[PDB]
Every structure is written in structure tokens, then in C-alpha cells.
């Protein structure tokens, strides 16, 4: 069969850059088409018959290639822009996997809380301890747990949102998942960011043994 | 003006069987060949199934193998997609798509219907308050939230003060844990403001039938 490949996965630039993305064929086809989709919502018709523009798609953008290769090419970009485009021909069962295109911006430190376990959940069974990295920039952030001095690295689950459509920062959760019991036997509890801003960390903590 | 709804999607036991109707509005519907499009967990889009105008041209995607089979009502302008022996590799939002021309670009989808294989059961979440604690804060500023836990399947809705503190909120994308859902949402207000004005997170799961209001109280140290 034939298959489809793009490149590259992610891109981010600044409003106002040119943008190119490509999609390839490991066998010579024709008329490849362009999806955008953003979250949330259906994909898109973008761009058909390898480069005429759908309704509503701004002059800025453009299609080309032949053969095996083909490019959707993006100039003067802006922040309505952003999106994951995915290309698809009339003979492919899977579209290609989309490249994610995103906003650059000024970096930012995250402002970072920690919560401890409600009391509710204790009684429960379980203990969560739940730290928030909200409003920073770039997207990638190192989180480390300590309890009571050492390292802890099992039982932490992160998830990041989306870019932020009206910022573009990103936020993110990690969050500490204990038994209750094994909850009960440490004291100290430090979550701390580590981020291309500062070379020192962010650090929230707590003791349980008060309040 | 043209309109394409789907419906029909849902959780389904593995081996089991769904139909999924889309219905058509705004346009000849007989006159246009249409499409099922699936887009998996990891975001891939795959072609699942097409069908002429006149419903006497049908294709099907490479991993469906016959346990598929669309079908159309053009009186009804309504297009349907029965599928049977479901696989947990068949969970994927479902598309409803119409073609333009004969080089088969899709110009309309619909809003999409979400179809779950597994053996999990509906399940409602848990919610728990999120207050500083014995990690009180001090700026002017202060970050609440609230964590949702244990449900299934996707999606849940949290808003803060029933809508009414929009700004400063983050609610993360859902996580499996011990294979039910936990996500966490945060609010940020002037720390003026609480605990004189009050806080609540309001909790929607729609699956369960379940709605519940948790006020964010200082904890009694
Ligand atoms: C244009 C096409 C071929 C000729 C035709 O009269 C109508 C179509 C539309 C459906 C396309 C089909 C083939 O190309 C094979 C496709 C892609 C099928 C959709 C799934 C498909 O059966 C497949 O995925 C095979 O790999």
C-alpha cells in the first residue's frame, strides 16, 4: 500500500515567521490534500487537490509538490495559526500523523502551589498530594518530589494543558499519588520546578504534622 | 447551513456491536458520496469507510475486515455505520464526512461520536477540596482547586462559582489511574477575597447522571 509521512511532529515559531511543513509518500501519488484541526473540534478542510485553498483559508497560505513530496508552506504566520495540520490522499487508509504547529513566545517562570491531601480523601484511604505549575513558557519543565529529603519518583502522574489560546503559556499538574498509610509514615513534602528561566528552582512544601 | 450530526456512540463490552447514525441537513444529500473517518486515543485519523452517492460503491479501511458496514437512507438523509465485533483498538471519535469531488478531499465533517471498548463500567468521580493547608500562601494572589477522581468514562465539566470566576483557571486533561479517570483543576483569585467571598467547584459527569458542589473551606488546622 502506499503511506504517508510528515516532518516534522512539532514546530513553533514566532507571529510573523514563514512556516513549512512537509508530508511524503513512499510511492508517487497526486491531489493530496490538508486538514487543520484544533482542540476540541472536527478537522477542517484546508488545502485540496494538492493547492487550491478552501473557503475561508487566507492567501498566506499555500500548497505544492508532486511525486512523492509535498509541503504546506505558511508565510507571515499568526496566532490563529496554531494548529495540527495532517495531510490525506485519495488511495491512504491512514492520514498522515500531523505536524503540531505552535506559538513562541517570551519565556515565563511558573508560579507553583502545593496542596496537601484533603481530609475527606484520607478518610477515604488515599492521598493525593497535588502541586500546579500554572502560566509558563516553553513547555519543558522538570518536576522532582522529595519526601522527607530523598527523591521520589514512583506514583507522581504530570499532565500538561494545551497552549494557552489567549497567552500562550503552558500549565501543568503533578500529582503525588500515596496510600494513606504510607502517607502517614513521612512528614516533609517538597515539589519543586526546575525551568530554563532560573538556574535555582521553585520550591513549595509542606509538613503534615501541621494543621 | 449545511448541517452534519452524528449520534449513536457510546461504551460497548469487547465483541460487542453499535450503530451509528449521522443526519444530514442543508444539502442534496443523494447526491453526494460520504465518509466515516476515525480518529484514535493518540490522535491518528484513519478512513473507515466510504460510500456513493447512489449506495451501490462501497470501500473499507485495511483493519476493519468485514466487521463493518456502512450504509445510507437517502429519504432520511441520514448515513449509518454498523459495526460488530468490537475491539479495544476500535475506540476512536467517529466522523461523519461529505466529499466534494472525484479526487474524494472531505469539504464538511460532522461534530463527531465517541465510541469506548473496554469493560469498565460507568463510574461516578470522587471530588475532594483543594485548600493551602498547613502550605497557607501569602502574595496577593492565592491558587485553590479541586481534584476529580476515580470516573468513567471521559468527559467531566468543572467550572468555578458556577461560571462565574472564567479567568485564572486551568483544568488539566484527564489521566488514567488504576484504569479510572483523575484530573485536578486550579482558580486563582485576590487572596482578599477568600474565605470572605466563597469558592466552589461545580462537577458535571454526564454519563452517571452526577453533579456535585464542593465549597473550598480553610482547613481546621
Ligand atoms: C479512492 C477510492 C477508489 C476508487 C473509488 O471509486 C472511490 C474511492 C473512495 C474510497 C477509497 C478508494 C480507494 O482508493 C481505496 C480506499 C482508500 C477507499 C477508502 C478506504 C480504502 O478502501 C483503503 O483504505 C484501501 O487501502
Known amino acids: 500500500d502506499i503511506e504517508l509521512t510528515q516532518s516534522p511532529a512539532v514546530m513553533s515559531a514566532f507571529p510573523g515567521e514563514e512556516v513549512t511543513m512537509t508530508c511524503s509518500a513512499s510511492?508517487?501519488?497526486?491531489?493530496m490534500h490538508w486538514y487543520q484541526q484544533k482542540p476540541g473540534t472536527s478537522p477542517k478542510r484546508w488545502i485540496y487537490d494538492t493547492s487550491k485553498l478552501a473557503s475561508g483559508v487566507p492567501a498566506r497560505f499555500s500548497g505544492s509538490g508532486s511525486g512523492t513530496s509535498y509541503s504546506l508552506t505558511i508565510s507571515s504566520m499568526e496566532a490563529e495559526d496554531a494548529a495540527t495540520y495532517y495531510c490525506h490522499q485519495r488511495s491512504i487508509f491512514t492520514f498522515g500523523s500531523g505536524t503540531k504547529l505552535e506559538i513562541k513566545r517570551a519565556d515565563a517562570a511558573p508560579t507553583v502551589s502545593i496542596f496537601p491531601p484533603s481530609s475527606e480523601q484520607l478518610t477515604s484511604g488515599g492521598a493525593s498530594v497535588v502541586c500546579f505549575l500554572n502560566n509558563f513558557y516553553p513547555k519543558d519543565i522538570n518536576v522532582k518530589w522529595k519526601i522527607d529529603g530523598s527523591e521520589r519518583q514512583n506514583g507522581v502522574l504530570n499532565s500538561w494543558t494545551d497552549q494557552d489560546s489567549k497567552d500562550s503559556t503552558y500549565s501543568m499538574s503533578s500529582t503525588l499519588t500515596l496510600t494513606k498509610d504510607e502517607y502517614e509514615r513521612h512528614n516533609s513534602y517538597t515539589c519543586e520546578a526546575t525551568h530554563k528561566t532560573s538556574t535555582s528552582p521553585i520550591v513549595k512544601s509542606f509538613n503534615r504534622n501541621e494543621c | 447551513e449545511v448541517q452534519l450530526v452524528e449520534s449513536g456512540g457510546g461504551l460497548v463490552k469487547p465483541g460487542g456491536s453499535l450503530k451509528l447514525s449521522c443526519a444530514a441537513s442543508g444539502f442534496a444529500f443523494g447526491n453526494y458520496d460520504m465518509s466515516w473517518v476515525r480518529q484514535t486515543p493518540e490522535k491518528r485519523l484513519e478512513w473507515v469507510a466510504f460510500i456513493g452517492s447512489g449506495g451501490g460503491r462501497i470501500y473499507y479501511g485495511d483493519t476493519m475486515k468485514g466487521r463493518f458496514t456502512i450504509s445510507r437512507d437517502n429519504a432520511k438523509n441520514t448515513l449509518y455505520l454498523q459495526m460488530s465485533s468490537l475491539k479495544s483498538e476500535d475506540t476512536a471519535m467517529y466522523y461523519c464526512?461529505?466529499?466534494?469531488?472525484?479526487?474524494?478531499?472531505?469539504?464538511?465533517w460532522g461534530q463527531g461520536t465517541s465510541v469506548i471498548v473496554s469493560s469498565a463500567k460507568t463510574t461516578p468521580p470522587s471530588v475532594y477540596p483543594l485548600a493551602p493547608g498547613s502550605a497557607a500562601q501569602t502574595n496577593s494572589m492565592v491558587t485553590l482547586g479541586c481534584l476529580v477522581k476515580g470516573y468513567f468514562p471521559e468527559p467531566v465539566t468543572v467550572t468555578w462559582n458556577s461560571g462565574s470566576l472564567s479567568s485564572g483557571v486551568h483544568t488539566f486533561p484527564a489521566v488514567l489511574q488504576s484504569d479510572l479517570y483523575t484530573l485536578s483543576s486550579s482558580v486563582t483569585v485576590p487572596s482578599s477575597t477568600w474565605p470572605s467571598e466563597t469558592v466552589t467547584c461545580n462537577v458535571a459527569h454526564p454519563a452517571s447522571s452526577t453533579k456535585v458542589d464542593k465549597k473550598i473551606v480553610p482547613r481546621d488546622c
Open positions: 464526512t461529505r466529499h466534494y469531488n472525484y479526487y474524494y478531499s472531505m469539504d464538511y
Open positions: 510511492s508517487s501519488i497526486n491531489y
